[PDB]
Each structure stands twice: as C-alpha cells, then as structure tokens.
Amino acid sequence: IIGGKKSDITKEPWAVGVLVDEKPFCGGSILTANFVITAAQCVDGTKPSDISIHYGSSYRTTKGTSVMAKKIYIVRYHPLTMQNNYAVIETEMPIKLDDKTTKKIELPSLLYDPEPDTSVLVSGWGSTNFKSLEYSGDLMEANFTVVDRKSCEEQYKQIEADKYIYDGVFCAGGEYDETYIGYGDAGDPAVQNGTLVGVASYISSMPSEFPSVFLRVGYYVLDIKDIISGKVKPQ
Ligand SMILES: [Zn+2]
Ligand SMILES: [Zn+2]
Ligand SMILES: [Zn+2]
Ligand SMILES: [Zn+2]
Ligand SMILES: [Zn+2]
Ligand SMILES: [Zn+2]
Ligand SMILES: [Zn+2]
Ligand SMILES: [Zn+2]
C-alpha cells in the first residue's frame, strides 16, 4: 500500500496472506473458518498444494499460522479485462478463529456499491512506493476515498484502459488521497461498515495518479455464497 501507515493484525483480524509457490504474493480475507477470498489473478491455474494461507500475524510470512489450500474456486476470470477478478480458497484444515488476531469478515448486501467520497479501509503487505516491487514485511493500512465509477472510467479512458472499469468493480484512492494499491496488494480486503465491500486488484500496466481498482463484492455475493454452499465446481 502506497501512502498508508503501519497497522496491526488486531486492527484487521480478517486479513490473511496468500503465499503462492514461485508466484507473486497476494492478500486475502477470512470469510469462514474454511474459506478465504482473494483476487483471481493471484491463483488462476495454480494447484492448491502450491498455495498457503498465512493468518493471525502482522508480518507477511512469519509469526502466525500457515495452512495449505485444498480447493480453489474461480468463476469466469477473464485475465484480458480482469473481469470477475476474485477467487475463493478452501483450506485443508480449519482456520483457528480467536476474536483477536483471526476473525471472519461479513459479506455485504446484494449489489452493494460504495458511494463516491466515502472511505474503505484497506490493509495488506504490498509495496509502499511505486518504484519498488518489494513487499512490505509489516501489515499496512489506509483509507481509500471512493471515486465515482463513471469519473474513474473517464480517467482510465485517457490511456485507453477503460476496459478494466465495469460494474463489478469500484474505484478508490488515486491522486486525491495519494493512496494506491502496491505490487503484492492484489486480494487485499476493502472494508466498509464491518463488511467486505471490495477485494483489491492490481493492474500491472497502470501507472500511479489513477484510482486503484477493487472487485465490488456486492456484485458477486450470490457467487460467493454458491461457492460456500458447495454449488460450484473447483478449478
Ligand atoms: Zn462472464
Ligand atoms: Zn464472461
Ligand atoms: Zn462503461
Ligand atoms: Zn460504467
Ligand atoms: Zn456500468
Ligand atoms: Zn501525485
Ligand atoms: Zn455472478
Ligand atoms: Zn457472475
């Protein structure tokens, strides 16, 4: 996270690390003791045994508990437009919730759409400046100001990138806050009123000065609940 500050896992006990064998780090969020949600770009086409979930720690890779993935659920991820950029990971063993450092985050109401000028709380271990691709050892947090979807699309259209902006995402941060999703921050939870309203995307082709992009969880709540009910085949 660029332009945030050092946090603590007790401030965002839903946040987890998603370690992917020989691939980029991502963040994630606890939905239930058995399910974690992250970005699709993190785990698309990756075997579950190559994926670890790191929970209950402020640190990126150490001092918590690690649990292997069992199944990966992807629902029509389109890497070209980054449409439907979410994945649900089922753990091999249950996550030990403790209402201190490890807690589930509630899903939002159907089609929830954060209002422009409101703020979402985002937390993760991605890069903390735009020159470095190195991850943060410490959990960082920031409030990202929500940018109107149309206005964000118009901005992205300037560099012909408007294809990344659609109803299934919302935009937050950017020049107004000087606050951005960094490399490694894909999958980071975005929280509003004690519910998970967004899941961070990372668009490698995008420079700074544009708002960051977040999966609109509301748009996909039926899909998330279908996955959790066992009504969706794993990858
Ligand atoms: Zn589709
Ligand atoms: Zn499609
Ligand atoms: Zn449009
Ligand atoms: Zn539109
Ligand atoms: Zn639209
Ligand atoms: Zn600037
Ligand atoms: Zn759907
Ligand atoms: Zn869908």
Automatic annotation (TrEMBL):
Pfam families: Trypsin
Chain segments annotated as coiled-coil in the UniProt record: none
InterPro entries for this protein: Peptidase_S1, Peptidase_S1_PA, Peptidase_S1_PA_chymotrypsin, Trypsin_dom
SMART domains attached to this UniProt entry: Tryp_SPc
Domain of life per record: Eukaryota
GO BP terms in the entry: proteolysis
Keywords: Disulfide bond, Hydrolase, Metal-binding, Protease, Serine protease, Signal, Zinc
GO MF annotation terms: metal ion binding; serine-type endopeptidase activity
Positions of the Peptidase S1 domain: 1-229
Cysteines paired by S-S bonds: 26-42, 152-171
CDD domains from the UniProt entry: Tryp_SPc
UniProt-annotated binding residues for Zn(2+): 153
PANTHER family in UniProt: AT26814P-RELATED (PTHR24276:SF91), POLYSERASE-RELATED (PTHR24276)
Official protein name in the record: Group 3 allergen SMIPP-S YvT004A06
